């Protein structure tokens, strides 16, 4: 109009004002001690139920020592993309260790779980393919699909009846790909692969699982959701997951046939066009895989802690939304009440972050608690005491 | 019937092999340095982006070690939830100070920074004006937006003006360019683009992956070089993985930009923050370049030397202006053969042909660094002379 196209500060102001009006403006907390089940926020020690540190690895000396070894040997940076002089021996060492752990012929690491989805989906899919995506799939899956030319269908969450209706109605001569989170990040439920994968065979579809929140959590020694349901050697199951949660570093990976690995090396755009991970990162992750083999009882402790916390929340009167994994949402309903409960929990010494629309539905705002192997009973009971006090105060529990 | 996974993979791998585009990367067997080891042999490495010699520098490694020991192996969360720690803020403050901008935000890569910042800025009804030769990660970031996308001929400010005149909007006009073009090593003409932006009420976005640590006073970057680092209508994105010899990307500009990105950039909202060893190395890098500003000088000395010697042999370096030093071979097969023959001489550089670069403009890309010595550069020049004579590109 009269004054011309917007300047940057005007565009920013208009978007920030809009977000503040919609109750979406965020001011994240700064942690002042390491990533542990007790940490420091705003000058205070707090029970931390906000992180993805499922196994207690993020500040574990074993990982730190292997990191240090690789840092000293190889340096601070790789200096290139994997394709052109950024692959070093340590990259391949980690890929081989991951494949062995996962039980697949091969494994390929990408720069994040977020980019792994983009890269793997983009390498696999082509115009005229059909994708069947779970309604509640992660945002990184959505962005990966949007960069492809595949036809995209959405099935109601975990609804295998709906999925079969779409598989009957929508055919192709190319690839049919059923795409799901393995463990859904917000509600903590598990994709029903026991039903999806047989369905896939009946309609000659491939299944793709983003197991970010199942790696190090489900299956024998944390080998993941796909391993848990017994499908880890099926070549028509594509396994993606992340190295940033249980494994407590950064990165994403795919695991399968030497030839799938070769496709990703040739085609995945975040692999072709982004720098490889540095030695300290890779050494920590090699450490993580060694430590879970040494201390597999961490996974048992994780699940013991989980069942305890969930049972005690239910006894107070809270709703954990049918969650099945250490992801333990507590329903508050409206986003303002979730955010107020998070504030009041912090006053009590408990750090857990409120989440509302658009991340989760209107009227299904929650606080996401993630239980870890490193939480103690007294930490969990402190968190439960805080939830009792706050919930009574807000009138959601008796 | 449908395709199964192995069939789709085989179809696509066979396709790439029939097109001669299937790649088999090499595995480096020693640290990222100007001399390294490939396939069991020592080589002069002209295939890194390690402009300042920081990748294996003990100063970065010691600061990395300190932060690893203090804070651990992982952040364990996205920045928005429980993944912002004191050391992230320390790095952002240090980066803003070095850049000369009001603010700085670190993101998981230069690749994802482009997606995050373009996504946060752009809305339906905005008009983008992109340089023909912009990086692939800019393309992917634009594809995720609902903005109208126009392409101007490479560095053609006449063309850009014609488009800016013809395509007005009540929303945002964003002129998007690499700062330093990854393949040819030329520099965006921001001294003409930015005035043109003012005339047509546009914002300028610069992906300065290959300018950060390279151009400008003390390596402050391309936007600093052209004098526009305090302009709120210039947005900079770059990588921390080349000169700064880590991983990560950053966005630098007006204070309000940072606030928008925190709230809106999808790779920021939906991915884990970087770990202490990575942040510590980068804090180290910013301290080291303030202590040893002569590294930037050496980088440019080395570049001028290499370029002049290649010209003296009879090679064409394509008008490159930065340490990115392409040598023209013409067709892709000859560039690949030259790269193979250079490796046999102990010189490691990257052959590039169509589709990445135009037909007839296939090249070997060499990146000179501050850490290359005269004897290394002369070894490279010796190999180029031998190979060039053998292939008849030079006399
Ligand atoms: C202009 C530009 N922007 C972003 C990146 C990615 O930064 P990162 O994600 O690694 O932080 C690159 C990379 N440069 C590589 C190279 O020049 O060798 C490439 C293999 C072409 S991709 C780039 O040139
Ligand atoms: C299913 C799924 N896939 C990929 C990623 C991205 O992995 P990264 O890029 O960090 O390696 C996530 C992240 N989970 C975060 C969290 O649940 O806390 C998120 C903040 C919702 S994004 C995820 O849930």
Numbering used by the authors:
A (entry chain A): -1 to 396
B (entry chain B): 2 to 396
What does the primary publication say about this deposited structure?
The α-oxoamine synthases (AOSs) are pyridoxal 5’-phosphate (PLP)-dependent enzymes that catalyse the irreversible, decarboxylative, Claisen-like condensation of an amino acid with an acyl-CoA thioester, to generate α-aminoketones. The thermophilic PLP-dependent biocatalyst ThAOS catalyses an irreversible, Claisen-like, C-C bond-forming reaction that yields useful aminoketone building blocks. In this work, we show for the first time that an AOS biocatalyst (ThAOS) can be rationally engineered to use an expanded range of natural and unnatural amino acid substrates. This was achieved by targeting a residue, valine 79 (V79), that is close to the ThAOS PLP binding site, but not thought to be involved directly in the catalytic mechanism. Structural studies of AOSs have shown this residue is part of a ~13 amino acid flexible loop that appears to control amino acid substrate binding.
Furthermore, we determined the crystal structure of the ThAOS V79A variant in complex with a PLP:l-penicillamine (L-Pen) external aldimine with a view to understand the impact of engineering at V79. We subsequently used the l-Pen ligand in structural studies and when ThAOS V79A crystals were soaked with l-Pen, prior to flash cooling and data collection, clear ligand density was observed in each active site. Incubation of l-Pen (1 mM) to the wild type and both ThAOS V79A and V79G variants rapidly decolourised both enzymes and led to the formation of a broad peak between 310–380 nm, with an absorbance maximum at 330 nm. This data is consistent with the formation of a covalent ThAOS PLP:l-Pen ring-closed thiazolidine adduct and this was refined to an excellent fit and geometry. The five-membered ring of the inhibitory thiazolidine intermediate is clearly resolved, and sits in the position of an amino acid substrate sidechain. The two chains of the ThAOS V79A variant align with around 0.4 Å RMSD Cα to the wild type ThAOS structure over the 397 residues. There is no significant structural change in the active site in the V79A variant with PLP: l-Pen bound when compared to the wild type PLP-bound ThAOS, with no shift in the loop around the altered residue. The distance between A79 and the thiazolidine methyl group and is 4 Å and modelling the distance to the native V79 gives a distance of 3 Å to the thiazolidone. It appears that the removal of the valine side chain increases the volume of the ligand binding site without any large-scale remodelling of this region. Removal of V79 opens this region up by around 1 Å, to allow larger hydrophobic substrates to be accommodated. The crystal structure of the ThAOS V79A variant with a PLP: l-Pen inhibitor bound displayed little change compared to the wild-type enzyme so this suggest that the enhanced properties must be due to subtle and dynamic changes to the structure and electronics of the PLP-bound transition states.
